[PDB]
């Protein structure tokens, strides 16, 4: 009983794991002047940000 | 007489000076995750490249 409240809920993990993954990707290309297809993550990094709270 | 051939003509200077100026700008924003308006230079850095020969 009360399984979701047995461990913890600091973050959704999956989402938080994806955000830190896409943001760290921009630096790579942006550093190698490959931000063309890389900077696009800016749209997913910003949208996933607000969802951080709506998620957990 | 022969003024354009008195000094030299390694490069157009103005163009070559602008290209190195726009390309060095991308690294700045791209490094501070500001490639949004910065990555746009990619269009001027690539177009000015081919013009490098058509110029001098």
From Swiss-Prot, chains A, B:
It is found in: Cytoplasm. Induction: Induced 1.5-fold by hydroxyurea. It comes from the Bacteria. The record marks 13-14 as: Cleavage. Residues 16-51 form the UVR domain. Forms a heterotetramer with UvrA during the search for lesions. Interacts with UvrC in an incision complex. The beta-hairpin motif is involved in DNA binding. Belongs to the UvrB family. According to PubMed:3515321, a cleaved form of the protein was observed that resulted from the removal of about 40 amino acids from the C-terminus of the protein. The exact cleavage site being unknown, it was proposed to be between Lys-13 and Ala-14. There was no indication that cleavage occured in vivo and therefore it is not known if it has any physiological significance. The UvrABC repair system catalyzes the recognition and processing of DNA lesions. A damage recognition complex composed of 2 UvrA and 2 UvrB subunits scans DNA for abnormalities. Upon binding of the UvrA(2)B(2) complex to a putative damaged site, the DNA wraps around one UvrB monomer. DNA wrap is dependent on ATP binding by UvrB and probably causes local melting of the DNA helix, facilitating insertion of UvrB beta-hairpin between the DNA strands. Then UvrB probes one DNA strand for the presence of a lesion. This is UvrABC system protein B. The chain holds residues 618 to 673 of 673 of the full protein.
